[PDB]
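Q: Structure for this?
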Amino acid sequence: AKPRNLNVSFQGCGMDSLSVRAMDTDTLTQVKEKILEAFCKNVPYSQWPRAEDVDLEWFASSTQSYILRDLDDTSVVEDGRKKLNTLAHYKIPEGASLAMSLID
Amino acid sequence: AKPRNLNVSFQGCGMDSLSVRAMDTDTLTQVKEKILEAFCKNVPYSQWPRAEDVDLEWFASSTQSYILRDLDDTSVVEDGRKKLNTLAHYKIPEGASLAMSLID
Ligand SMILES: [As]
Ligand SMILES: [As]
Ligand SMILES: [As]
Ligand SMILES: [As]
């Protein structure tokens, strides 16, 4: 378990990508929080998108992208409860290209 | 009364400025709506900032900027009611540089 430096683009407008450091053990909500803190640092917090307002997609291949969520159908189920997905759960590599998107 | 092409920056992230056409007779809410439509075209409408979430500032001089609102203390008062400020009310020139900002 180590830190991961992610190259995140925020899709929808022509912003530059940002390098964001997250932890393998961060839940993907926490990963989103860190990304939003990085992108929205110069804006009042009352106006930031929330974790629930955005998807985070990992471009694993040219043809395969995986939407990274806390809970989904790849989540470990333990003693009758789902466990939260972490960055390490999806085996996200160092320098991975991620895209963040506002959703309906 | 004519159209005005405004050079609008959206401050807070490193987006390029956009040229936005507004009418002299547009209320500043309508001007904001047109600007948000231009900047947020590729994002779901449920996630756009609203007119009330942003200020629009006109850099009239190097040292003077005026926040452009529908109603303020420069508004014409007629028969006991304030009249909505328009783009023409502030005498905004063609090719004017404006900045839009998210507010608390
Ligand atoms: As955006
Ligand atoms: As932001
Ligand atoms: As912004
Ligand atoms: As937008």
